[PDB]
Amino acid sequence: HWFYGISIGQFLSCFKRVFIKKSRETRAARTRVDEILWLLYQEVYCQFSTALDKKFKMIMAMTMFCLYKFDIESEQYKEAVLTMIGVLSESSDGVPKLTVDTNNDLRYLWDYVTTKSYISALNWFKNEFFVDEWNIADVVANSENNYFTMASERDVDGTFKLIELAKASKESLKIIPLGSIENLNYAQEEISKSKIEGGWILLQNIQMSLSWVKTYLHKHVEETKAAEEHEKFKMFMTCHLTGDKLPAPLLQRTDRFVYEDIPGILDTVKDLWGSQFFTGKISGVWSVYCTFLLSWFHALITARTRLVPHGFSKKYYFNDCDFQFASVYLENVLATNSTNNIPWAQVRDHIATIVYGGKIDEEKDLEVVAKLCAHVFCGSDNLQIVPGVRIPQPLLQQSEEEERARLTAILSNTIEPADSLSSWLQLPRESILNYERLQAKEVASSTEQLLQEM
Amino acid sequence: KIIGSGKHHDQVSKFMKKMFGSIESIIFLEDFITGVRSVEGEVLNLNEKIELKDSIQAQEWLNILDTEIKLSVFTQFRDCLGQLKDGTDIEVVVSKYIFQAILLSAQVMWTELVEKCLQTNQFSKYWKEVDMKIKGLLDKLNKSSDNVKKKIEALLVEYLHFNNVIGQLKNCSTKEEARLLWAKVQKFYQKNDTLDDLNSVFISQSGYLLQYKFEYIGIPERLIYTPLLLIGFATLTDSLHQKYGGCFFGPAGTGKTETVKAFGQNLGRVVVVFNCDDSFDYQVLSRLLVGITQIGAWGCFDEFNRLDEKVLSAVSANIQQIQNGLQVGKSHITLLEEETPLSPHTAVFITLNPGYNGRSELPENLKKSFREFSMKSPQSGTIAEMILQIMGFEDSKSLASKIVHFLELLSSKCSSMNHYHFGLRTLKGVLRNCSPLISEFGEGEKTVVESLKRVILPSLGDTDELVFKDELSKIFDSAGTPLNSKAIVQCLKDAGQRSGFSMSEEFLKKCMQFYYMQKTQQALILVGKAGCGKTATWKTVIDAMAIFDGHANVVYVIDTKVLTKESLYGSMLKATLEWRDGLFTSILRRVNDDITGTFKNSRIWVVFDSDLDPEYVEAMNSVLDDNKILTLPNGERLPIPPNFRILFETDNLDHTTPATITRCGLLWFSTDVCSISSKIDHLLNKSYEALDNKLSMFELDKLKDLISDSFDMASLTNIFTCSNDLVHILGVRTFNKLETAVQLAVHLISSYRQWFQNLDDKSLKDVITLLIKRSLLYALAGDSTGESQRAFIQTINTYFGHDSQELSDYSTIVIANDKLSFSSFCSEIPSVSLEAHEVMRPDIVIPTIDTIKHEKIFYDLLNSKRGIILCGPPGSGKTMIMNNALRNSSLYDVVGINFSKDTTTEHILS
Ligand SMILES: Nc1ncnc2c1ncn2[C@@H]1O[C@H](COP(=O)(O)OP(=O)(O)OP(=O)(O)O)[C@@H](O)[C@H]1O
Ligand SMILES: Nc1ncnc2c1ncn2[C@@H]1O[C@H](COP(=O)(O)OP(=O)(O)O)[C@@H](O)[C@H]1O
Ligand SMILES: [Mg+2]
């Protein structure tokens, strides 16, 4: 992948830290060489896994655990774990050479894998490093660089996380979105004055201005080695993993990491519902109720988007533009029509086909969106979107503020069950198990292939 | 040029098409402007004539005319709407007003009436009224002129949309469902209590309102209204309401750009279409973008996904600038390094085609300002019913349902094949071929049956024909019969038996299918393995039609793959700026330009007699389509006359695109059109007629009688079946070796005509039989190992009669001028000695039995005027045997070309 580039200098700095990091006396590995090797593995995983996404985090953890335990442990361990990864991958099958009372943790791993709990089996290797994965706080504080790239997918943006960090980190995060030539000139003035003033600056969505970055930002960051001699400022970049390929030298000069934090369905509902009234009310009570239902539907559709090929046969990024268009349509239909609910039948067919079904190009996914809309919008005085919540229709006095408070209360009362992806969404649990088995198979195949090379 | 044309004022009309997009000319008066006329041909008369003094600038009077045409269109609309509201017949009002005005008046009246009809829920009366209006328009279409016919067809399209919507509303069970359906349908309204007349009429869809700008649109190609089209309109109006642009993406040929253009026409706008990936310069596009922003027109980027990366980035930046200015509401946006006003009525649409990587999406900077939508091919049944309703078909719903069911049934039951395509395109082809058949038989079910049998049946294989017949019988209750049978069948029999061809049932069937297919189709494809009879079939049909109608025929047989694209279509000297005709365009110009020759009363045929590939046919896809024009990359755009017909003679379609197969009438030869003992007879007659010019009468009659009765198919059928048992190097089926056998036999018989007059009948019969055996052996098993040749010799001596002179491995007729007997001998084994200095010359050969036999057969094949192919391992002696056979003779001179991994065709000529 174009984002996971690694250089010799970064590796050597990471190894330098192995000695220059007297945190806590680790496990007694006899000779000092073994302890240094273990610390090297720990530091490499702790630093260089931030620049990777979840799947490659798992792949790195498993591969480096295999590399370490193919030397520390015995053959009864090596062939056991080799056949174990063969079992996890769906390409091979068999029983490992389980030596009783000799490889205990391998027996816990066997208990995990037989119970078909793939996620815990893959997190076992991460747990065996006994190291806490660096959050962005650790990366921004520890790394002695002024430039970071915050990559992710198109579904989640970590701008709020960076805002929360920098508000708690010494001053004034300053968001500078790109776009038209006005945005470009504003950004260049802002950076030229912020390298002197020292405030942390952020560059949302670098990708759309790729041609600009190839010409202005590239040579700038490559030449401004005196920025470290300027005031202590930090320049951030937000990109997309699926986006266009950033230039290699620009990416190499800056630090990189991948923001992997998918909020829960209830968390997304709460965030959207909170943000909707921040801009102020537009119409009466029914507009508020329809906006609440639209927030629920948007959260459900976005959550189902991530699963593939279970749920949606592809990945359709439903951004906030779809929500805005659906909200505008809801306001229009509730303004032209009357207070009664009669036009629900046309609220669905427009939302399920025109605003949220426009991007869809397969009939199965269109059917999925249509049935989701039918479930969410068709309601008669009591709506059960997920099996844990019931939404009563507005009152008779039509007190809008009380209705908004009641909707907030009914959001706060409920909590998300651990099996929400099977209960809150309509797809079955066996579908989730198949998806997890597929991802575990991919991880095991990739790590075995890497093991063949190394 | 316009600036310098400020005195004549008549040179602007050339550029009116470019600067207005819809009107092609300005109709002048002696000193006034008396109107305009569009590309389709239609006089829009301005209410107020424009005076043109000599001192006035072109800019000023063009500016006044720009508003005058819109005001005239509104005046026509207002006059027409009132007349229609009065209750005037649509037929009496068609002849008065332009298509756009009558269209908008109709749409507004229909919306007004159906609103109250929906209020009262009485749809039957208005449905019947609209049906009567449609029938009146249909019968007036037959009695329409060349200009009014397009207007009537477009009004039929819109009126059938009206009737479809009214019927769907009638079938709705509940008022809620009826209003749901009414919301999606694009309704039209006008404000009776407003000023600024040009903003009176607007359009409401899904609750969103769009103003109707009264720009003249002419009489455009109206798209058939389908429930997938109105969803496209709803998506476009949803995007336009929030000021977002409009993006379509989907498979090519789904009419994305045509849907955008139809949306513009319904709103009264002409959409400026920027065509991409046509070596389209960026500066001209930037100028067009500035014009779009300043005027307020709608700009559609056709095939936007194919552009150079730098050009794509620049144009995306410009589009983002325009869209940001529209969304914010700011005026005077900054582009082209200039601040220019931005009219708020501007809009940008994009159509993205699927690339090599599969799906194509917008650049990142545009994804935040464009609402993408996925286009699909329409449902077959809906537009099938719509087209059948376009024609005067009764029970059009039932006919369309039956046709669609039959097509799906065929696709499910018939054996899979590469050219078997029963999608929507096949349906549209069936309906287009059904259209001209209405003159012969009426608009019943049997017309559809005949069109299906004339389109689908020829393209089907042998085993699927029975499926076609029985499913046609069990789906369509009535099975028709074809007319014009006796005359053309007799003419085909005459034109075939005149050329020696055998009128078997299969050959006559294929000829009849080709004749019926060419009756309506313009581009023909004939597919079948080598030797089926494609050339024989189409030549026989050409001769039959020449004898029948009396029209002369001009045939241009061109091999496409021999000639490069520059030679076939036309080459341009980019370094000297001259365009060369090429081959196809030269013979097209010789048709259009010339009139002295018999070119109006004659049928022109261009037979591409070679394998076809997508690269060659994509340069003439416009010829294949309904445009019927050859679009050269640079030069005049040639119109093909009705007589000009393109045929494709090939043997496979493993590389031809589905579009070409669907557009072109396909005739598939699943089997040989004649049996073995009909091709043999045809070749025998073709050789007898050649010998006839250099022989006496009685001798020739006796000789041909002996040749005919000497062999019979009873004995030869076993030989032809046994020849397949032999292993053949460079294998060719015996149906193609028959030519070599017959030609060699006849030539060998003819070569000894001097020694036949004084020859006894028994010895003469033995000579003829032996020579026939020799020819049969060297044609059927002539490409065998050499021991299998002896096995075939034993087979030959077995299956023929036991009394005729047996053929041995070396039996040759040697004739001496001093004796009269045939004196057949074999195995000479000559001897020769040579000096030391002659040990290596390029012409020294040691004569052995193999060398003599090979030389004799090679020379006999050469004298038969047929090409030879010597196939053997390296060093076997093919070149040596040729050069020895031709060095002895003083009639042939050898030219040795040595082919390599790539020898271009001009190497042979050089
Ligand atoms: N009706 C017929 N009766 C007898 N012989 C026939 C008949 N039709 C065709 N033939 C024989 O079959 C031959 C087929 O020639 P033709 O050029 O039509 O073949 P084709 O299948 O189109 O192949 P090609 O690809 O070589 O052009 C004719 O030359 C003739 O010898
Ligand atoms: N009967 C023969 N007398 C003399 N030379 C022969 C005879 N048969 C085969 N050869 C040799 O076989 C070789 C075949 O050469 P050539 O004709 O160039 O091969 P090809 O026909 O495959 O191109 C000749 O060089 C010749 O010397
Ligand atoms: Mg032919």
Given a contact cutoff of 8 angstroms between Cβ atoms, the answer to whether A87 and A113 are in contact is: yes
**Rounded CA gap, B28 and B13, in Å?**
10
Query: If you ran DSSP here, which 8-state letter would residue B899 be given?
Result: -
Only one residue has tokens 């749409």, namely: B107
**Is the CB of B210 inside 8 Å of chain A's CB atoms?**
no
Helix (H, G, I), strand (E, B) or coil at B888: coil
Residue B541: which residues within 8 A CB-CB, separation 6 or more? B492, B511, B514, B515, B518
DSSP characters for A175-192? E----SHHHHHHHHHHHH
Helix (H, G, I), strand (E, B) or coil at B862: helix
Question: Ligand 3: distance of its center to the CA of B651 in Å?
Answer: 9
- Torsion of Cα atoms, B265 then B267 then B269 then B270, to 10°: -20
Residue in A180, A349, A360 closest to B374 by CB: A360
Q: What is the 3-state secondary structure (H, E, C) of B591-637?
A: HHCCCCCCCCCEEEEEEECCCCCHHHHCCCHHHHCCCCEECCCCCCC
**Is the CB of B238 inside 8 Å of chain A's CB atoms?**
yes
**Is the CB of B365 inside 8 Å of chain A's CB atoms?**
yes
C-alpha B478: how far from chain center: 31
- Residue A94 in tokens: 């068999």
Cβ of B177 and A345 within 8 Å?
A: yes
**Rounded CA gap, B192 and B203, in Å?**
14
Environment class of residue B21 by beta-carbon count within 10 Å: exposed (0-12), middle (13-18) or buried (19+)? buried
Please report, as a single letter, which amino acid is at residue B602. S
Atom of ligand 1 nearest to the CA of B678: 4
Given a contact cutoff of 8 angstroms between Cβ atoms, the answer to whether B362 and A319 are in contact is: no
Cβ of A243 and B364 within 8 Å?
A: yes
Closest CA–CA distance from residue B217 to any residue of chain A (Å)? 28
Cβ of A325 and B231 within 8 Å?
A: no
Experimentally determined by? cryo-EM
Given a contact cutoff of 8 angstroms between Cβ atoms, the answer to whether B779 and B787 are in contact is: no
**Is the CB of B328 inside 8 Å of chain A's CB atoms?**
no
Question: Ligand 3: distance of its center to the CA of A245 in Å?
Answer: 54
Phi-psi group of B500: left, alpha or beta (phi > 0 → left; psi -120 to 50 → alpha; rest → beta): left
Question: Ligand 2: distance of its center to the CA of A448 in Å?
Answer: 60
- Residue B399 in tokens: 């006919």
**Is the CB of B820 inside 8 Å of chain A's CB atoms?**
no
Q: Is B678 in the pocket of ligand 1 (CB under 6 A)?
A: yes
**Rounded CA gap, B219 and A36, in Å?**
84
- Residue B534 in tokens: 């494609």
CA-nearest residue of chain B to A341? B176
Q: Is B883 in the pocket of ligand 2 (CB under 6 A)?
A: no
Given a contact cutoff of 8 angstroms between Cβ atoms, the answer to whether B70 and B196 are in contact is: no
Mutant choice from A334, A354, A355 vs B, greatest count of B C-beta within 10 A: A354
**Rounded CA gap, B803 and B809, in Å?**
18
Interface of A with B (CB under 8 A): 179-181, 205, 207-211, 243-244, 321, 324-325, 328-329, 332-333, 336, 342-343, 345-346, 349-350, 353-355, 358-361
Q: Name the residue at shortest CA distance from atom 15 of ligand 1.
A: B533
Q: Judge whether B660 is annotated as a binding position.
A: no
CA atoms within 13 A of residue A431's CA, in its CB half-sphere = 16
Phi-psi group of B303: left, alpha or beta (phi > 0 → left; psi -120 to 50 → alpha; rest → beta): left
DSSP characters for A87-144? HHSTT--------TTT-HHHHHHHHHHHTT-HHHHHHHHHHTT--PPP-HHHHHHHS-
Ramachandran angles phi, psi of B3, nearest 5°: -60, -45
**Rounded CA gap, B791 and B468, in Å?**
46
Environment class of residue B4 by beta-carbon count within 10 Å: exposed (0-12), middle (13-18) or buried (19+)? exposed
Q: Is B536 in the pocket of ligand 1 (CB under 6 A)?
A: yes
The residue to mutate among B501, B510, B538, B650, having the most atoms of ligand 1 within 8 angstroms of its beta carbon, is B501
**Is the CB of B371 inside 8 Å of chain A's CB atoms?**
yes
Question: Of A283, A277, A224, A217, which Cα lies nearest the Cα of A251?
Answer: A217
Q: What is the bridge-based pairing of β-strands B572-573 and B629-630?
A: unpaired
Greatest CA span in chain B, whole angstroms?
A: 121
Q: Which residues of B touch A321 (CB under 8 A)?
A: 244, 368, 371
**Is the CB of B208 inside 8 Å of chain A's CB atoms?**
yes
Ligand nearest to the CA of B849: 2
Q: Which residues of A touch B184 (CB under 8 A)?
A: 349
Cβ of B231 and A179 within 8 Å?
A: no
Q: Which residues of A touch B334 (CB under 8 A)?
A: 181
